[PDB]
C-alpha cells in the first residue's frame, strides 16, 4: 500500500500548476509565444523535478 500510494501521489502531482498559468504543457505552448512559454515550462519542470 505504501508503494502504491507513493506512485499514485506522484501521478496526482502532475495536475499542479506550481505557479504557472496551467498544468498542461500543450495549453502553455498554444496560448503563449516561445519566450514567455519557456518561463511557464521552467516552472512546471522545476515542480515536477
Amino acid at each position: 500500500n505504501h508503494n502504491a500510494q507513493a506512485l499514485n501521489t506522484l501521478v496526482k502531482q502532475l495536475s499542479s500548476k506550481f505557479g504557472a498559468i496551467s498544468s498542461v504543457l500543450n495549453d502553455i505552448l498554444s496560448r503563449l509565444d516561445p519566450p514567455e512559454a519557456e518561463v511557464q515550462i521552467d516552472r512546471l519542470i522545476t515542480g515536477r523535478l
Binding site: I21, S30, R31, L32, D33, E36
Partner: protein, 49 residues
C-alpha cells in the same frame, strides 16, 4: 486585421500572447470600449486601484 482599424502601437494581453490569438477557440468574446486619459491607461489592468 485589428491593426488596420486603430493606430494603436501594441496589444497588452494577459494570460495569452497576441501572436497566438489566431490559434485558439473561445466560447464567447467581449469587447468593452470607452475613453479615458493617458494617466489612467495603466489602471486598465488586473490588480489596479
Amino acid at each position: 486585421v485589428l491593426y488596420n482599424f486603430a493606430p494603436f502601437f501594441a496589444f497588452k494581453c494577459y494570460g495569452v500572447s497576441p501572436t497566438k490569438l489566431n490559434d485558439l477557440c473561445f466560447t464567447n468574446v467581449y469587447a468593452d470600449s470607452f475613453v479615458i486619459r493617458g494617466n489612467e491607461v495603466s489602471q486598465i489592468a488586473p490588480g489596479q486601484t
